[PDB]
Amino acid sequence: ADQLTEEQIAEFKEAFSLFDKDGDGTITTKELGTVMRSLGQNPTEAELQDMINEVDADGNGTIDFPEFLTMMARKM
Ligand SMILES: [Ca+2]
Numbered sequence: 001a002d003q004l005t006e007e008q009i010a011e012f013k014e015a016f017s018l019f020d021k022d023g024d025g026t027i028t029t030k031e032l033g034t035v036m037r038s039l040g041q042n043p044t045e046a047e048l049q050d051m052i053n054e055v056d057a058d059g060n061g062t063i064d065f066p067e068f069l070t071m072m073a074r075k076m
């Protein structure tokens with residue numbers, strides 16, 4: 001696997017949009033909490049900040065498409 005599968009990426013892309021309720025191309029902690037809550041997960045503000053920090057490599061403070069791609073890949 002040189003780069004990645006165009007399908008696996010797409011599936012994650014559609015998942016990125018579902019979480020991007022504002023469509024601004026930037027998943028914030030508030031949006032990540034809404035989703036995690038819909039999946040039955042109750043993350044705290046400190047956990048969302050750290051969960052985002054472990055993957056926020058641009059230092060923007062939020063997860064975008066490529067950043068969310070990496071994060072989901074880490075879940076294996
Ligand atoms: Ca968003």
Ligand SMILES: [Ca+2]
Pocket residue numbers: 055056057058059060061062063064067
């Ligand atoms: Ca980031």
